Amino acid sequence: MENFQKVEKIGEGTYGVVYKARNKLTGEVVALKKIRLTEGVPSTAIREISLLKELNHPNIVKLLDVIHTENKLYLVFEFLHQDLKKFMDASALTGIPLPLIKSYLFQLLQGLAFCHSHRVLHRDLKPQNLLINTEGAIKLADFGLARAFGVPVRTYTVVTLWYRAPEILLGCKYYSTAVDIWSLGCIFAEMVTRRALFPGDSEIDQLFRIFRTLGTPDEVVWPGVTSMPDYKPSFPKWARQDFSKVVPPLDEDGRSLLSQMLHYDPNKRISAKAALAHPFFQDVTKPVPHLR
Amino acid sequence: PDYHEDIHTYLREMEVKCKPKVGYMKKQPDITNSMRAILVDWLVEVGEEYKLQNETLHLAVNYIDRFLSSMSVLRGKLQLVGTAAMLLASKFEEIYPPEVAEFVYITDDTYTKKQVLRMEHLVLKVLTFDLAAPTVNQFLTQYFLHQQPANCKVESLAMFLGELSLIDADPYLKYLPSVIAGAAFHLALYTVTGQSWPESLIRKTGYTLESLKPCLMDLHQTYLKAPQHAQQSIREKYKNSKYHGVSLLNPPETLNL
Ligand SMILES: CN(C)C[C@H](O)COc1ccc(Nc2nccc(-c3cnn4nc(N5CCOCC5)ccc34)n2)cc1
Numbered sequence: 001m002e003n004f005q006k007v008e009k010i011g012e013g014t015y016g017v018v019y020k021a022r023n024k025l026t027g028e029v030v031a032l033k034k035i036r037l038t039e040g041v042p043s044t045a046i047r048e049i050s051l052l053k054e055l056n057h058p059n060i061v062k063l064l065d066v067i068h069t070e071n072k073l074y075l076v077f078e079f080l081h082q083d084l085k086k087f088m089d090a091s092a093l094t095g096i097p098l099p100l101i102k103s104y105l106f107q108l109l110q111g112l113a114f115c116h117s118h119r120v121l122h123r124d125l126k127p128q129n130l131l132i133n134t135e136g137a138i139k140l141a142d143f144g145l146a147r148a149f150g151v152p153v154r155t156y157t158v159v160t161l162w163y164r165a166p167e168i169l170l171g172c173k174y175y176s177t178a179v180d181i182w183s184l185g186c187i188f189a190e191m192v193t194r195r196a197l198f199p200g201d202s203e204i205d206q207l208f209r210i211f212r213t214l215g216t217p218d219e220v221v222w223p224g225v226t227s228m229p230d231y232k233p234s235f236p237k238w239a240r241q242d243f244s245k246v247v248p249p250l251d252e253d254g255r256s257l258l259s260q261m262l263h264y265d266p267n268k269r270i271s272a273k274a275a276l277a278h279p280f281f282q283d284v285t286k287p288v289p290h291l292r
Numbered sequence: 293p294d295y296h297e298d299i300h301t302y303l304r305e306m307e308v309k310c311k312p313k314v315g316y317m318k319k320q321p322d323i324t325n326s327m328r329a330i331l332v333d334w335l336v337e338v339g340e341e342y343k344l345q346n347e348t349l350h351l352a353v354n355y356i357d358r359f360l361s362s363m364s365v366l367r368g369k370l371q372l373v374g375t376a377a378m379l380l381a382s383k384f385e386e387i388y389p390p391e392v393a394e395f396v397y398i399t400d401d402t403y404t405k406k407q408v409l410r411m412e413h414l415v416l417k418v419l420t421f422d423l424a425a426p427t428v429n430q431f432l433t434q435y436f437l438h439q440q441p442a443n444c445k446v447e448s449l450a451m452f453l454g455e456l457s458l459i460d461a462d463p464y465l466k467y468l469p470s471v472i473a474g475a476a477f478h479l480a481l482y483t484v485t486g487q488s489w490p491e492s493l494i495r496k497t498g499y500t501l502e503s504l505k506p507c508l509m510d511l512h513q514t515y516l517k518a519p520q521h522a523q524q525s526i527r528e529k530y531k532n533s534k535y536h537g538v539s540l541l542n543p544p545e546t547l548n549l
Contacts, residue, residue, distance in 0.1 A: 043383035050423040117298040150430040151347045
């Protein structure tokens with residue numbers, strides 16, 4: 001712990017503080033994650049360390065070291081410059097170019113495809129959790145709510161409201177990889193439109209917003225939906241809107257991929273592995289962003 | 293779907309990386325297989341008491357075994373290892389794990405709260421934070437997807453047999469989780485429906501019925517001698533209508549192997 005000069009605070013958490021730091025001996029720039037310690041080591045810390053230890057991929061943030069003392073617990077990460085959310089605001093006027101939106105999605109889906117292939121659900125993808133550098137790399141971060149399956153992961157009675165999948169909101173017993181694809185779906189659209197796709201202020205409001213855009217799900221489109229714990233027969237029946245009115249700047253492939261990512265029934269929603277071969281990425285490249 | 297095959301292949305690769313040292317119990321000067329049998333059974337009770345998932349139990353066992361694989365422990369401290377492992381598994385696997393005070397309370401205050409937390413810390417160090425272990429339970433749930441159609445009794449019985457394996461370090465430390473699960477699933481499938489280790493699973497696992505024989509022979513004996521065994525929590529647990537009272541199903545006399 002003595003080798004790390006704290007450079008500047010960069011984050012606020014319930015577990016603890018995140019600082020940008022540098023190794024005094026090697027000059028390597030890192031992200032330090034402080035965790036204050038009466039319930040022992042926080043479970044999220046246990047999960048994050050354990051699961052990241054396994055996942056070594058260019059599109060997942062690299063945990064470099066875990067400094068483990070009697071009184072404090074530190075997580076050493078490779079440093080990335082800023083999150084996607086900050087870049088999205090910095091782009092509010094000019095917008096993110098399509099080449100770069102395409103690159104970001106491609107890379108995210110690759111990280112995610114790697115997670116899912118190693119029985120890891122992220123569960124909480126959002127602009128704040130996705131890190132970018134100046135060379136066009138984007139990486140999945142914050143695995144505090146990440147979870148191992150191989151035994152199906154049961155849902156509570158967690159996720160940020162806006163990027164939640166409808167099956168969770170409707171009260172499904174189990175999670176699945178489908179929920180991570182949904183999230184990426186929303187992030188994809190948001191990069192295209194410059195606006196959050198489903199920005200609900202409450203659970204029921206979040207559900208209703210999804211409905212007004214994709215239509216109110218029925219038994220034909222989603223078998224079992226009307227039997228789900230939190231479904232109500234008195235739900236307004238909205239009609240599916242045209243994706244050309246939802247995401248105007250997107251070509252036919254964009255709309256195609258997006259719709260499959262925002263597919264209602266989890267079982268039929270596209271997986272990260274399958275989305276990578278979609279015609280949308282036929283000409284993917286690696287553009288560099290302009291960061292302040 | 294498209295990930296199912298990769299996840300199997302991955303758990304397969306990882307189950308080798310997370311296995312304990314087979315003959316660790318011979319190098320533990322102050323504890324025996326018998327002592328561990330008492331410990332794991334008590335955990336089964338704790339698992340029922342606090343209504344914790346079965347995965348939590350399997351993980352805790354793996355932590356305990358891996359810990360003991362490199363750390364000499366006195367008999368009086370064995371339970372402290374057991375408790376903390378159980379706490380860590382709860383933190384890893386459960387949605388809302390029981391509070392530390394609850395893990396203290398269940399030891400008749402043999403250890404303080406200060407002690408349990410320090411043991412948690414030490415186990416984390418010894419295991420080098422590597423908590424996401426493959427378990428018999430994990431492999432069974434995979435193998436279940438290969439049923440035509442799904443049979444609840446088969447599943448509960450296979451589960452019961454896999455759970456029983458946890459108790460007796462001799463012989464079951466000899467076998468990888470994938471193997472025990474295979475033996476378990478076949479035995480349950482044979483007991484309930486008469487069918488055998490399916491063609492689909494042979495291809496997936498690479499394990500032939502012939503290759504499952506050694507383990508299958510041992511598991512068959514544990515199943516047979518189950519009501520005589522010194523530890524009984526699992527049998528009691530699986531008498532329950534929740535698990536289709538499978539512990540009361542008569543084992544086949546011979547396996548026709
Ligand atoms: C909105 N702005 C004010 C944010 C600022 O632009 C500043 O954002 C940022 C964001 C990231 C960096 N660098 C970085 N590189 C690698 C890894 C990490 C990293 C590892 N765990 N966490 N947990 C986090 N947490 C997320 C959950 O809450 C606790 C912190 C936030 C970041 C990280 N962070 C630097 C700055």
